[PDB]
């Protein structure tokens, strides 16, 4: 079809993608990218000015490990803290947590103690970096708040905490040089891998073997 060696076309444009006189087309041109960048920036700062004396994002999100085996080690932000993390931090009212700016996610649970401790200490450094304004402007004033934290409410751009990925990018940091352990000298890791893989394959066989053994025991 080419009179050459070029690959098989595989073009995938058989269905009126082209805006001609007869067709409307299946084309979307993103010429708005440039203007929309500035527009998004402007509406983001309008969001800030609207919810001013608060984080521009606003809810504290938890840190969860990315899902699959490929992204196990990469951490990221979640949707909200588990009620166990809230109770461990000291918050037993999800609606109050939300009103003071901690995000809740009752769908999530802690499948391990590491996530629990990590997000608990996250909430605990929150609620200490946090200056609550009092309702009605002149009643009770909480601890730590010094009566000029209310005079100087500063809107930070990013939430104090490090980057979300900087929690897996710290667990992925090897130790210092060390001595070997005698089990690390005797252990055959490839033999272990092959053994634990042959294990899942020899199951029914490792039942028929027992059955034959006990039949011959009878006989």
């Amino acid at each position: 079809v080419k009179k050459g060696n070029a690959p098989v076309p595989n073009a995938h444009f058989h269905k009126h993608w082209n805006p001609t006189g007869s067709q409307k087309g299946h084309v979307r041109c993103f010429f708005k990218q440039g203007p929309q960048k500035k527009i998004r920036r402007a509406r983001r700062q309008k969001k800030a000015a609207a919810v001013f004396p608060r984080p521009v994002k606003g809810p504290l999100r938890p840190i969860v490990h990315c899902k699959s085996q490929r992204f196990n080690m990469k951490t990221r932000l979640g949707r909200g803290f588990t009620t166990l993390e809230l109770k461990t931090a000291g918050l037993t009212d999800r609606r109050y947590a939300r009103t003071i700016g901690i995000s809740v996610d009752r769908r999530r649970r802690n499948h391990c103690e590491e996530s629990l401790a990590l997000n608990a200490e996250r909430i605990k450094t929150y609620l200490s970096k946090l200056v609550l304004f009092p309702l009605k402007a002149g009643k009770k004033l909480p601890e730590g708040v010094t009566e000029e934290d209310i005079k100087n409410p500063v809107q930070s751009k990013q939430d104090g905490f490090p980057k979300a990925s900087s929690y897996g990018k710290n667990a992925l940091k090897p130790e210092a040089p060390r001595k070997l352990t005698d089990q690390e000298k005797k252990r055959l890791t490839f033999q272990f891998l092959r053994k634990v893989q042959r294990d899942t394959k020899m199951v029914g066989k490792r039942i028929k073997r027992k059955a034959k053994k006990e039949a011959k025991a009878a006989k």
Partner: protein, 203 residues
């Protein structure tokens, strides 16, 4: 409670009690018209759980849909073109009879808003459904917040647009996840979104 007992009575539909009652009701539906205004919902429990109230803003309408598949309206059964599209008789509608019934009642009562419907009866010739409609310009409706959302101009002809429960059913929206892959936000919206040729400024 009373509605639980009603629900289980109506769950055992082949029982002799429910057969007797449904047979009398089928007879009187056949001797009524094709769209009748009910004075009160048959299946009080069902209408209550679908969102009926005995306030003056709600109305119940019964409607029949003739059983069977769809025959395509080609003169003398002559479908030109190719053998695939040359089928006439063994076709089946995309909508289901519940939403067809809702559509008929909503087109007949144009100034009302169609919330849920429910199967009430079925005989050899027809299936009978009851449709709950709400008068959006009634003070009770406009006052009660729980139904107040029906009075907004976006809620006109949900039966016509497939927003009701039967519509969500035949649009594939019963399931989500991997069993409603090409369903949301719409089948045609999805098709457009993944048949789109996107030309960025730099490619």
């Amino acid at each position: 409670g009373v509605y639980t007992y009603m629900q289980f009575v109506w769950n055992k539909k082949q029982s002799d009690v429910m057969r007797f009652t449904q047979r009398i009701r089928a007879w009187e539906y056949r001797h009524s018209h094709r769209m009748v205004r009910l004075p009160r919902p048959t299946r009080t429990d069902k209408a209550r759980r679908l969102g009926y109230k005995r306030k003056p803003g709600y109305v119940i309408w019964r409607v029949r849909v003739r059983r069977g598949g769809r025959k395509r309206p080609v003169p003398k059964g002559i479908c030109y073109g190719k053998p695939k599209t040359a089928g006439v008789n063994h076709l089946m509608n995309a909508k289901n009879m519940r939403v067809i019934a809702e559509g008929r009642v909503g087109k007949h009562c144009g100034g009302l808003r169609v919330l849920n419907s429910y199967w009430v009866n079925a005989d050899a010739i027809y299936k009978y459904f009851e449709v709950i409609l709400v008068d959006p310009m009634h003070k009770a409706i406009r006052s009660d917040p729980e139904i107040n959302w029906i009075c907004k101009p976006r809620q006109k002809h949900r039966e016509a647009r497939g927003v009701t429960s039967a519509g969500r059913k035949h649009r594939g929206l019963r399931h989500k996840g991997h069993r409603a892959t090409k369903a949301r936000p719409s089948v045609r919206a999805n098709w457009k979104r993944r048949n789109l040729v996107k030309f960025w400024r730099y490619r």
